[PDB]
Structures are given as C-alpha cells and as structure tokens.
Symmetry: D2
Subunit: 236 residues, 4 copies
C-alpha cells in the first residue's frame, strides 16, 4: 500500500538511516539531540534528516502526496528561558545547511527574505522572539508555519513547558491543501493547535528530504532541543 | 504488526461491516448520516458501530491499547443554529441504545448521573447547550471528553462552522493515559484542541465497540450529523 | 490507506472478534483449536467477526488480499483425519445442514453448485477412496472453488506435530491465488497457484476464517492455528 | 508500529530514493532494468539499492529483525536461453560493487570463496549454470540461497518462463531463523519454493542495504533482468 512509512521508538548512536548535519547527534540514552548539549555550553546549529529522499509530488500524473508525522520532544532550559527553538521541515533532496545561517533561522535560511528558491516548508517551535534580533517574530513563544521564509505565514501562541515532553502530530491533507499542527503536554493537559493552507506542488521540488533542525544562538540562555521518537508516513 | 487497522474513504449504502442502530444510515452519495435527514424534518437518534469488537486492554498481561482515529464530518443547520450534536465513542462490545435515551445524551446514556456501570468514553461535538434541557453543559458549543456521564470531565469552546467540513484526529497514548482531540476546518483555518487523562483499563471492559452517535432533539432546529470518512488503528 | 488489516499474534479464550461455529474454540494456552481436542468426531469453523468487501459492483474493482498463519496438525497415531481449511464464504455464513468432516463444514454435498459461493484452501489429511472418492492419492493442499473436489492440488509433505507457516496471496489484476507453505523445523516446503476470479464466484461481502473436521475419532488429530494476519484492499 | 515499510508500484527515471550502481537504471516505461538493455547488446553488471540503510539486528538488545519483501520481475531472452541471472540481496550499508566482480557473481562477489568478511545474504535466480564458467552451480536454472558465497547453501530447480512475469514473496522469520522464497508465474500456474535456516545476526552487520543485482556475462546470449514493482517491510 502506502509509499513510505517508518517509525523510530528510540534512536541509536550513529544511526545509519539518519543524516547528521552540524552539531546534531544521538546520545547514549537514545535521544536525538539536534542541538549540542555540552559541559561548557556553546552556540549551536544542527539538522537531522531521514537518509532517503521522499517523492512529495509527481510531475507526470500531477498527484500530490498526503503525509502524517508524529514525534515527542523536550526543550529544557537552564534558567527560566532559553533560545532558539526547534523545527520540523521539508527541503530539497539532500539539502545542506546554508552558508551564513544562524540559530534564529534554525539552519534553514541564509537570510530573512522570502525567496521562492529556498524551497522550504517548516513547522517551528520558536522559543526566542527578541525584537532587535528576530524582528520578524511575534511577542511570545510560538508555533509557526514557515513557507520559504523565517517570517511565518501563520503563528499561534505556544504554551511551552520547561523540561516537559510534548507530543506533536502534523498532518497534511493534499486534496484540501491543509497542514495541521497538533501539540499537547500529557503532564498537565496543555494543548496548542494551528492549521494553514499550503500547496506543496507550488513550493517544493518533486523529491524532498524531511527532518529536524534547531539552534542555540546564545550560550548564556542555553536549552536542549531533544526529539525522543519519530513516526512518518506519506502516500501519493 | 498492529492489531487492527481499517479505513473508509467513503461509505456504501447498507455497508455490512457497520452496525446501524436507530436512524443511522448511509446515503446514495456515500455519506454516513448518523442522524436522519428527510423532506419533512423530525426528531432523531442514531448510532453506527464497526461490526467487530476491539480488545482495548488485556487482563492477562495487563497491557492497555493505544489507538488513533481520524474522520471528517459536516454539521449543516437550516437556520443559524441546530441541535443536538455528534459523538465518537467506545462502549461495551455490541452495546445497544439505552432505553429512555435522548438526543441530548446522543443515544449513549439513560440519564445524567455518573454510573461506573455505563462503561462509556466519548468525544462529543455538542451544538446544543440550553440550560433548561441540558443543565450540565457550558455556555457555548463545545468539544467534550465524556467518561461514564453526559457531563464532560473537560470541555473546550468549539468554533463550529455551519456546513463546513471538519477534520478530526483523536489519539490515545496508553503509556501516558493521554487522550488528545484535534479539530480543524480546512476552509478557513479554524482549529480547536483538547487533551485529558483517562485510564481505559479503569473505565471500559476488555472488549469494546467503537462508533459514532448523534441526535436531533427538536426538529424545528434541525441540522445534519454526517461523517464523510473514517480511519482507525489500535495496538496492544 | 488499506481497507483492512488485522493481526493476532495469539488468541484469547472467548475472543469477541471471532465468531465460533461448531466445536471451534480457543484454549487457555492461546491457540485456536478449530477441532475439538479431548476424543470424538468434530466439525468447527472460526470467522473474523466483521464481513469484508471483496469486490465492488459500483466501480467493478476487485480486492487483492494477503494472509499469513501458522498451524499444527498433531495426530495420535502416524495418521489422522480430516484436515483444515482457510476460506471465504458469504457474509455471516453458517455451517450447512448435513455437512461432514470430509467437507470441512463447508459443503452439503460433493456437487459443484455455483450457489455455494465458497473459495477455500484446504490442507487435506484424509484421502481414503471409501469416503473421499474426489481426492488424489496423497495428503494434499487444494484450491476449492464451489466444490470439495479441488480445481487444483499439490502433494503436501505433512509433518506430524510440527508448526507450518502459510502465506496466501491473491493478486486481483492477474487473478492469481498463491499458497506458500513451509516447515521451519526441517525446511520442507510446498507451493501451489491457480487462477480464480473472485468477482465471478463470491458475493460483494464475505466472511473469512478457518474450518476443519475429524470424521473418525479413532484416527484423531488436532487442527490448531497459532497466529493469524490478514489484509485486503480494493 | 513497524520500523520500516516502503512500496513501489512502479519506478520513475532517476528515482532519488534508489542508489544505482553499474548499469542499473529505470526506463521511461517505469521498469527497473538492473541489467542494460541496449541492442546493440553488451556485457553488463548492475545493482540498485534502497537509499536508506536498514537495521537488521540490534547489538544492545540482541533482537533480530523479521522482514518480508515482494516483487515482480521479467527475464526475457532473445534466443531460447540467456545469462546470467538476477539476485535480491542484503549487504553492508552502502556497499559498492567489488573490484573484479563478474556477471556470474551478480556484482556481489570478488571470487568463488566463502569469506565471512563478504557479509552478504542473497536470493539468486540463476539462469546460467555452465560448468566451464560456473562450476559451483547445479545442472539446471535454479533459485539459490547465498550466504557469503556464490556457491549456494541450498538450491531448487527454477522452471523459468521466457518473457513471463514472476511474482516473488520472500519472508524471514527471526524467531525460527527461517528464510522462505515463494515464486509463481500467474500466466500458467508454475510455482517454485525453497526455504533455509539463516542466522542474520551471525552473517550481517547491524546496518545493511537491500536491493537487486544482476549480470549479462555474454552479449551473445542476452536477456533482460527487469523488476516491475517492489514492496518491503522490516521490524525488530
Ligand atoms: C545563503 O545560502 C546559500 C546556500 O548555501 C548560498 O548560496 C548563499 O550565498 C548564502 N548567502 C550568503 C550571503 O552567504
Ligand atoms: C437506562 O439504561 C439501562 C441500560 O440499558 C437500563 O437497564 C435502564 O433500565 C435504563 N433506564 C430506563 C428507565 O429504562
Ligand atoms: C445443504 O446445505 C444448504 C445450506 O444449509 C441447505 O439449504 C440444503 O438443504 C442442504 N442439503 C441438505 C440435504 O440438507
Ligand atoms: C574483491 O573485492 C573486495 C571489495 O572491493 C576488494 O577489497 C578485494 O581486493 C577484491 N579483490 C580480491 C582479489 O579480493
Ligand atoms: Ca525566533
Ligand atoms: Ca448538549
Ligand atoms: Ca479428504
Ligand atoms: Ca550461474
Ligand atoms: Mn518565529
Ligand atoms: Mn456537552
Ligand atoms: Mn482434498
Ligand atoms: Mn547459482
């Protein structure tokens, strides 16, 4: 049946079906630390992609793929606040971190402009919204749908819980071009949701790579960006 | 792998793998009308269950099942308002509509009391909250998590859209006992979400039947309760 | 995606999603004994509780399906009767009046009536010409279409008390039905394929399951299925 | 649920999730020609692997994976006979064609010795058994289970049909270490089967790449080695 379906209940150090870029890696406890967690802390940018590209749309038949993904993640800050955030994304097949990318752009963008050549769709869990540094951001931690730009086309207030596990379910229904983000914290019932219209055929190439990215722009306001598990399915 | 998984992209008149109770039926256009839609309007109560019971928990091993379900539905009211609502539920294997049930109880309850003998867990999409007849309801249309009672243990404001298709994803994660309801309207981006803790092993018997139920208590304030598609998976 | 997909790694006593007919039941050890184990003559069938749409009359589409199961046939002596079968019958079908162990509770007679609407894969242990004149001269795997007299058979190298793994696939576009049997204990393998048009034999809605029989208490054997996987898609 | 599951109903020219080695490629008609079809004909060796490695066993837990795969293929010879054959295999992650490999070794082996360092398990559909060049082969076209050597640990007569489509189902049940090969020709009912005991944990590394390989050692006895579709699943 379905074109593709994979599931990681846990990660293993030096997992061969995951492409690690930047500081991303998996600890001995089995968690994907997309951002570096080290004794003397430090600035960091990392991305982790599934090793095989996925056909998101077909130019022959014109068909677009519907997909669903689920993952659990933890963002633990030392103080009461941290930077910069985590993102789930779709980019051109075997994409590399752009030259001159920063933590605030999650290793996804070279700048704050909206270039159609970026060919990136991402769901961000943005923890830093400082106005002189991230002027494009709203005045609160948020969940945003990014389409070719770090300046989200739509955002929603994210009630982040320090050190608590968040369960996320993202669905893309091709026939209606609807992208829905479902987030909940089992520990206390906190839930956030956001949906937006996005035509994948219009933004991305036929073959894409999916994964996570994140960054810590200021070592003094450190936080982790750990993903505990990951499920993904797609079908044309 | 997984214990059970079924998918209905559409329904067919007199579908043999669906048990119809009350006024529930599937039209020639392939939609499950859990509530009766007729030239001259009338009061109605209906339920539709998947024909085979599902083991939600094992008494031998003590294991509890995790499940996920997705469905799209439409509630179209003649005037600007309608009654009474729709519900997705889990009940004892091959459960029948209780004697003396009403539209306001969605054919799930005999009364407004919280009896542990009911053994019912349901997610309701309640359109009628009139304090004269439904005193247990909040002052707005809502999504509620019902556990052995029509008086929800938790509700959230439901931004119902007249005649628009709503996509719903319900997930139950056994290890954390977390039940999450994710609703969105692709037509305009409206999204509602709610999460609650529920121990299935404590409320339901080992074998249950899953399905939809609904009711129209006042023909003068008529509305449809149509489910367009349905996906379901469970695993112990 | 796929219309239906279920999996039983083990069975549980009085499983609610299985319809038991005749002497079929599940033991406390979690195995489906389609035939009664205790001794006496027996006939039993076990069906999945929900019907399955095998073909659509609107679109004309036919469903492709795959199933996998493991079973054991343990005889007391060096031989036993009568066999086990995997089948597709009309939705919520009952055991026919006057059925016998040699017909696995699937047929009223040895005639080929199109009204039977039955397709079955049999693992036939008894081929005595006295009671089963339609059978070949050896234990076999047969593809039955509306009759106990198989349209095609193949020698079955049955192993007493050993677990057999079976994979049955039906590829609708080519109308091909393949039966794949193997004994992990010693490598013994048997295979058979035949052309069958489901749309021509069965109604839109069918019930799937197992059936079996022990026609002679003196030549007793079990007909136990240990696990079961099934998928179908239109 | 399941670790991995992919399905190709057809192939597309320059498919990004398939690694092509040697002469392997996919035609405009959507078929994977692991061997070159040029006419002007020529000698050829080709391999096609799924782009992402698969974890076949875990050294931490000791668990071994069970897997199932299905594919349809055609071997069309110009004359009444052709060479050399096709193979489905599991090799070390991102394995390359060995230096000095030949068509009779399907681009899998450097020699006819049984080296444990080869770390290869393959199911071959061998069309050439000439004792002059393939002395290790039996006296008929066959299906063989290869474990670290081109000299099969077990074979069975293969009733090859020129130009007809063959459906193959290969299952590996970890608990019993049983590998079963199920082949059938829908056109005439011809069926062949073979099973053998193989401990994956003992032969292969934790991470492996799966795919097809084939060869045409003599351009004068040309034949195609086309795979039409491919399904694969694995679970630890
Ligand atoms: C932005 O990133 C792209 C990709 O690496 C690169 O080609 C471009 O030069 C970058 N812009 C700058 C100013 O570095
Ligand atoms: C309420 O429902 C229960 C279950 O069907 C039934 O036993 C009880 O008698 C009902 N109450 C009335 C008044 O019928
Ligand atoms: C054979 O079985 C069918 C179905 O139960 C029944 O209608 C028929 O009368 C049976 N024949 C006899 C002789 O009982
Ligand atoms: C055989 O293949 C291996 C792998 O490429 C290589 O290391 C070796 O040198 C080759 N030749 C011989 C003679 O083994
Ligand atoms: Ca930011
Ligand atoms: Ca109400
Ligand atoms: Ca017989
Ligand atoms: Ca050879
Ligand atoms: Mn932002
Ligand atoms: Mn309510
Ligand atoms: Mn027979
Ligand atoms: Mn050989």
């Amino acid at each position: 049946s379905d074109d593709l379906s994979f599931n990681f209940d846990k990660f293993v150090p030096n997992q061969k079906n995951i492409i690690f870029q930047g500081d991303a890696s998996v600890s001995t406890t089995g968690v994907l630390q997309v951002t570096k967690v080290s004794k003397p802390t430090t600035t960091s940018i990392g991305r982790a992609l599934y090793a095989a590209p996925i056909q998101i749309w077909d130019s022959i038949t014109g068909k677009v793929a519907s997909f669903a993904t689920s993952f659990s993640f933890v963002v633990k800050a030392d103080k009461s606040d941290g930077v910069d955030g985590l993102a789930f994304f779709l980019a051109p097949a075997n994409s590399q971190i752009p030259s001159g990318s920063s933590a605030g752009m999650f290793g996804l963008f070279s700048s704050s402009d909206s270039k159609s050549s970026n060919q990136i769709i991402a769901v961000e869990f943005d923890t830093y919204f400082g106005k002189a540094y991230n002027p494009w951001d709203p005045d609160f931690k948020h969940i945003g749908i990014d389409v070719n730009s770090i300046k989200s086309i739509k955002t929603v207030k994210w009630d982040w819980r320090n050190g608590e596990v968040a369960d996320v379910v993202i669905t893309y229904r091709a026939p209606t071009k609807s992208l829905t983000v479902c987030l909940s914290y089992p520990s206390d019932g906190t839930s956030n949701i956001i949906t937006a219209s996005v035509d994948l055929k219009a933004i991305l190439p036929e073959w894409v790579s999916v994964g996570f990215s994140g960054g810590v722009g200021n070592a003094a306001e450190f936080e982790t960006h750990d993903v505990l598990s990951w499920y993904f399915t797609s079908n044309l």
